């Protein structure tokens, strides 16, 4: 592939189907294996196409371990708000676009397509508010249905030129510096030249496109969650292959018998094999020949084939840096500080995606206000997203470790409502408008002292009695 | 559960699509609605115009199941409502398809015929786009939609052939059986499989003999039977894990674990059911959206930031969340009015209640209010004091 | 990068803030879950003449105090 | 690599030989025709019910123990 200077205004079509669509298939058939993968159904290393059976066991032991962990990761990941420098309150600007575009139910999808494939995208466009004002539509896009090209791929914050493909199978988009170009797509791998192309100068400036990478790396090889443990979940998935193999070929203690005749009942042409042979606890076997011998073959133990799993799930949850508890075993007494160890390394990795996916956030925000001029949140570059905590301390601990800090150290007890589990920003704001409040339960509810109500309505009862 | 509508800086539920939730029996529709769109992968809300039963405008509200419908959208990823729907009646009668702004019905005799005799109903209520809301499971940025059941198929399987494999043993090879050799055969006049009721009576006083120094009884052993069991115990702990739900609710009993520790365990499942927490209640702000908008209300319609709320789904006992509530209340000074709605066992309608009966002039409530551990205190304490000193 | 519980943390840090009378400006961004920006958001918001910072300031465990528990005071005296 | 090389040597004792190995001595050979490979889904039925027995007394049936698969687990852990 090469990076063309010009944007072939008359012959962009060329262009993209001789050095776009190979590269853009070459890479969307990786994605469509890994998003398979991801879902279930783990690279089988070894699987016998001669044996309906055993191919019927090795798909009944393909274990979805990599989804779950897909999953975990991305259920733990929430934006909630946008704190700017020196403001404890949500700017009224890339908030009100965010609250409007769904954004809370789009990020868990985007964060779980970052971890998966490596690289999420996020599509902000201008357009027209419910009112009629402006109104940035942000949107994203899997790698899948995407390739954007970047000629310096460690840096480069927005790409040059990338071709996007609508869910639909029906239009190819090509994304300019400035103008929208549309094709049409009747049916996959045909770009007739009849079709005019459409070109919209709606105006954004560079190419409006945010890569949400997964781990930042100096010398690019982005990867996703699910690549990196590939050969791990194939070998947990083959222990259970083998260990279904055992219980199902030999776990039973084989009854044999030697000495007697053979080719009874009438020479048995494999005809009437509805034999029937009763054979209970009553029932006792015997024959009429002394040189008859029944012998019984041990089965396999069944024992070593846990004991494997279970070590490959461990491995499977230290290497991702996933509590083991949360994938095999039992959690033990653990206490305050033997737990924040256990999970310290979830912690960590957890913060990091947070801090790579805020920055992503940050540069999806600071597109979206540019879009409709306010120049205020372009010039910000401080202004960083806040997420919710992730944190595995019980409510009581942490509610009397911050009311001890309130207490003592002085802090902020404003700050301190939104870190108590189970409160969210919304509740804040709803405490915030309401706290001092006219009505009888506020103001009973404020002064309230141990021994009934306090302040003026425990005031006036004095002042009564003094009069 | 959903349980009130609080909008952005009220702490009271709107006057508006609460009373179109309420009256059209949701809460007990919901759990279905969940159920369907936790097992099939996507429920399907269905919003109509109706009148109430003073004469006003009702919203009626119905969930169908993926079974009984069909959605197409143009884009899948993001549509909000689809742009035509066949929706097939629990009856079996009548086929409806659901146009943007006509109500098209038709009929259904017999289970694939569509005779042209019948005259096709069209009915112009009014909604504006496709009144269907979409109850996703999971949200994923290239579709692939699909249910909780679906993923864990296999794991499933698994532990029912592992079932069926520890039955297989206990059910053909599990006690000893007792052989014996040497003794002659064809007995009892070349049984012919005649008179099966043998009745050779076996105890423990009977003590077996035979006419012959050439005879030996053997014994097979049988099948140990543990290995089944840790196999079927690792499965079930396998299926719970995949699908972040608690071990000790499916195999097993809970050890004595600490705060912190239920807290661990606990917390991938809280996590899931929060992110399907938020996903659920954007579905229904959607819904609630819809359901204002059909009956006027610009306030419902333009209000994009009301959101609903949910029952706290947390696994922590009463005396502990009871006293960190306090001393939160007493030290950090959180208002106490919306704490009453995070202990266990109250409701929104108790704190209704609370709120609605909290100062009243009878003296049930004046005695309990001004409350001291020596007695009343308050104005009935007053009037002793004021009493005493005249 | 301490692998301290916050509770334990935040206890002894407490106490040492009001035994050995350490700086409890800097203290604030020692407990795990507060960074720089949040240190500085309650130092630009800590004597806001909005009601909620005065009322959470001014805090005591038998309702607000200050000039707020100050006012009914005087309205008695009064 | 020594980590990956002991993880290797599990693999290898649990695909090739982990399983009671069931043989039998005595009985004849060269059966099904002089087999040349052909039609080698015999499907031998064999289950819990079923029963094997032979046509000659001098028919022995063996059983080859497995390896424990302990040692490796003890192994890879240190």
Redesign the interface.
Known sequence: IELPDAISDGEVRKLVENEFWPEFVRRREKLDRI?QWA??EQPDYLIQN?NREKRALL???????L??VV??FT??L?VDGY?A????ENAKGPWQTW??N?M???Q???H??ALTYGY?YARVLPGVA??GANQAEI????P??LLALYEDQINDEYPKYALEL???GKTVRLYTDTDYYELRMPSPGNFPNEQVIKKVHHGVGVCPFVRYVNMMDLDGFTMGEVEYLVPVAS?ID???Y??????????????????????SEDATPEEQQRAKLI?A??D????????????????????????????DVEILANNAQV?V?????????????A??????GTIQKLYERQVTFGAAHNQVLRLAAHVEGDTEGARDFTA?VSWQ?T???????????????????????????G????ITK??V????????DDD???Q?????????????F??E??????T
Not at 419 to 422: H, K, S, T, Y
Not at 444 to 455: F, H, I
Request: hydrophobic share 40%; charged share 20%.
């Open positions: 998003a879902r279930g001669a798909k009944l032991a393909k274990t979805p371990w989804g779950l999953t975990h259920q733990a929430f704190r420098e020196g403001s404890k609250n409007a769904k809370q139910s789009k868990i999808a985007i779980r397509a999420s419910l009112d949107h994203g896009v899997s899948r249905r609508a869910n639909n070998k083959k222990t259970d083998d260990r279904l193999l055992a219980q199902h070929y030999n776990s039973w203690k084989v009854k044999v018998a030697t000495g007697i005749d053979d080719l054979l606890q009553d006792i076997l015997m024959h009429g020949n002394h040189e008859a011998k029944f012998y019984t073959l041990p089965e396999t133990s069944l024992d070593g084939f846990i004991a494997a799993h279970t070590q509590p508890w949360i994938l095999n075993g039992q959690l033990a007494n653990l206490s305050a500080d737990l924040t160890a256990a999970t310290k960083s905590d944190s595995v301390r019980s409510l009581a601990q942490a509610v009397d470790a911050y009311g001890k800090a309130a207490t003592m150290l002085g802090m902020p007890k404003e700050f301190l409502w870190l108590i589990p189970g919304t509740d704001e709803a405490m915030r408008q309401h706290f001092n009888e339960m506020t009973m509810l404020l002064w309230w002292t141990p021994n009934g109500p306090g302040g003026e425990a005031a009862i004095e002042v009564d009695s003094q």
